Design a protein around this ligand. Structure first.
Ligand SMILES: C[n+]1cn([C@@H]2O[C@H](COP(=O)(O)OP(=O)(O)OP(=O)(O)O)[C@@H](O)[C@H]2O)c2nc(N)[nH]c(=O)c21
Ligand SMILES: Nc1ncnc2[nH]cnc12
Length: 288
């Protein structure tokens, strides 16, 4: 089905992205780790310690359930309930002294846009990231692509009170049309809400635009410089020649198109390959 193909494609993107930035022995902090479904990806890269934090105790309880049911992994796994975006990370990790900070990489998958609810939250998130990371370390992940959002919004007339687009498996519905009223520009980079539906995945949940230019300029303020901004389509097209034979048999077959090449085709292509982008930054200097 389209949704199964989308999940496999996005899982492949995460495999490639994690492998790109993680090295053997690294300590990884995963913000908004949800139910902790990427442990095997980090294990393949040879990490020494995974620290996952999520605001939901139901999610962490599930992540712990899932972790405890695995095997004799070669790495330590720490799973913590805490708010990675709205509060100092020190709050969440005070009672987990086994964490080894500063860490080598910070990851955040399909979640960092929640930090753009307000400027205060965006900045608190970035301060948490840089305080956690070694100089030279990387911050990477996957977000909705503001540039694709802007393209779709630029095709919506101002008469539409709640700008919306979608297909048989996903939909985006903006809370307001202030973008269109303001000359096709958001009135603020923060708090620009839209509800997101994805079949059997996200149940019409409010989230916020993450305008990439603002993310990048704020990250620079906190000492992080851009490493990667490729949309999922371009990232996959560039990385697939080196990855076809590295994927598991099941993931490779899942990516196989009707023409014998790899990727997504059919209705999942827009939400899987255009709606999201990769990001990465490197911490190049200390922040006072
Ligand atoms: C958390 N989240 C997940 N997605 C999309 O949903 C897909 C699945 O999201 P996922 O891999 O985080 O969870 P899943 O339900 O697959 O696994 P489980 O938690 O282990 O049961 C992703 O590949 C994205 O397409 C998301 N899409 C958007 N726009 N916003 C989100 O907050 C978001
Ligand atoms: N602030 C937050 N911290 C951690 N996980 C989250 N998921 C959604 N918002 C979150």
């Amino acid at each position: 089905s389209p949704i199964i193909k989308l999940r496999n494609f996005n899982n492949a993107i995460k495999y490639i992205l994690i492998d790109k930035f993680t090295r053997a022995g690294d300590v990884v902090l995963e913000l908004a780790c949800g139910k902790g479904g990427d442990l095997r990806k980090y294990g393949a890269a040879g990490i020494s310690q995974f620290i996952g934090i999520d605001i939901s105790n139901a999610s962490i309880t599930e992540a712990l359930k899932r972790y405890h049911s695995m095997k004799n992994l070669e790495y330590q796994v720490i799973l913590i309930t805490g708010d990675c975006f709205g509060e100092s990370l020190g709050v969440a990790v005070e009672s987990f002294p086994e964490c080894r900070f500063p860490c080598d990489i910070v990851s955040c998958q399909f979640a960092l846009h929640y930090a753009f609810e307000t400027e205060e939250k965006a900045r608190r998130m970035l301060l948490n990231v840089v305080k956690s990371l070694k100089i030279g370390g990387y911050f990477f992940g996957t977000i909705p692509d503001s540039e694709f959002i802007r393209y779709k919004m630029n095709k919506i007339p101002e008469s539409v009170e709640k700008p919306s687009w979608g297909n048989s498996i996903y939909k985006v519905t903006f809370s307001n049309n202030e973008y269109q009223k303001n000359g096709n520009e958001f009135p603020s980079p923060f708090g620009q809400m839209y509800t997101f539906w994805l079949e059997d995945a996200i149940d019409n949940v409010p989230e916020y635009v993450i305008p990439f230019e603002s993310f990048r300029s704020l990250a620079d303020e906190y000492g992080m410089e851009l490493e990667l901004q490729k949309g999922f389509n371009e990232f996959f097209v560039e990385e697939i020649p080196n990855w076809v034979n590295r994927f598991s048999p099941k993931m490779r077959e899942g990516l196989k198109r009707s023409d014998g090449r790899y990727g997504v085709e059919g209705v999942e292509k827009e939400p899987a390959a255009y709606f999201y982008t990769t990001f990465a930054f490197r911490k190049v200097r200390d922040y006072q």
